[PDB]
Curated annotation (Swiss-Prot):
Keyword annotations: Ribonucleoprotein, Ribosomal protein
GO cellular component: cytosolic large ribosomal subunit
UniProt similarity note: Belongs to the universal ribosomal protein uL22 family.
UniProt-recorded name of the protein: Large ribosomal subunit protein uL22
Lineage, opening ranks: Eukaryota, Sar, Alveolata, Ciliophora, Intramacronucleata
Gene that encodes it: RPL17
Organism: Tetrahymena thermophila (strain SB210)
Domain of life: Eukaryota
MF terms in GO: structural constituent of ribosome
Signal sequence segment: none
Gene Ontology BP term (one): cytoplasmic translation
UniProt key word Repressor: no
Keyword Ribosomal protein part of the UniProt annotation: yes
Length: 157
RNA sequence: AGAAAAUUUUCAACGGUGGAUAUCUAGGUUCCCGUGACGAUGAAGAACGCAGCGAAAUGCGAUACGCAAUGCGAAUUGCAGAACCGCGAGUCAUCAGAUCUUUGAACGCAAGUGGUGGAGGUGUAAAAACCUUCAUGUUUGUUUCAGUGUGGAA
């Protein structure tokens, strides 16, 4: 399980990398949480994810639209539909936390970390069964995650 | 030029899915040559067992991954403990002597049963319990026999 991040940061003493692999969270959901985190401040990402968890804010749905509920919360976005994929958020959040603690040994400051490169990949699907009428059986699976995120320090003048 | 994103889409790089391709092989396949060599002295097959730590596969049978003999002459090894430098190591080979549970042509009778007869041994005051033994056909004989079968002396 050695992570190869597809994209690399320009300054690696100035960067922080996290990845988790072969997760059990829903792909599409995770995908969109992440897609929503890109390009923010680590502190912001954390606040806003916590806020999604507390339901006071929505995680926009971008790529996977299939019949997703419209909320007023989607105003923040320009969107109609979004949700609160709690499990995904919690996992991602844990990843951000690994980012911050991952900055510790580097002696880097949190305030100026910015998130560039979230990557969510469809992992090997976990397999099981579903019994169907007439004695048919159909697949019942889960689509797992690979996630990686790196954070750059950018100084604000 | 609703000249930003999202979606739809072309191309590349990297990553993910996936296991194609290439290169291998204690395998297969076919050809030629050599031996035919199982069994009531209980075969082929079946059951259950047997390692200090073992399920399988392979070996083995209460002497149970093995005894003996012989040849190699120092290992086994995943762990632990011993044994051995030749009084000889070994998961080595060879193999001509042994061990060979319950079965199965399967055999006292019977059987989805470790059930149950007779004879002998044992055990006991007498028992129980344990042990050995008994299938059918056939060729000779041995012994004991039957037949208003054929003969037949005193
Ligand atoms: Mg990985
Ligand atoms: Mg059903
Ligand atoms: Mg590829
Ligand atoms: Mg020896
Ligand atoms: Mg007879
Ligand atoms: Mg007569």
């Amino acid at each position: 399980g050695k992570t190869n991040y597809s994209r690399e940061p320009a300054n690696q003493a100035k960067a922080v990398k996290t990845s988790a692999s072969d997760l059990r969270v829903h792909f599409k959901n995770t995908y969109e949480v992440v897609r929503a985190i890109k390009g923010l401040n680590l502190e912001n990402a954390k606040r806003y994810l916590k806020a999604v968890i507390d339901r006071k804010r929505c995680i926009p749905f971008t790529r996977f639209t299939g019949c997703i509920g419209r909320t007023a919360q989607a105003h923040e976005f320009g969107r109609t539909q979004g949700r609160w994929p709690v499990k995904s958020v919690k996992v991602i959040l844990g990843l951000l936390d690994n980012l911050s603690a991952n900055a510790q040994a580097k002696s880097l400051n949190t305030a100026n970390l910015v998130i560039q490169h979230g990557q969510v990949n469809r992992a090997q699907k976990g397999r099981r069964r579903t019994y169907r009428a007439h004695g048919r059986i159909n697949p019942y699976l889960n689509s797992g995650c690979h996630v990686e995120i790196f954070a750059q320090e950018v100084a604000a003048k």
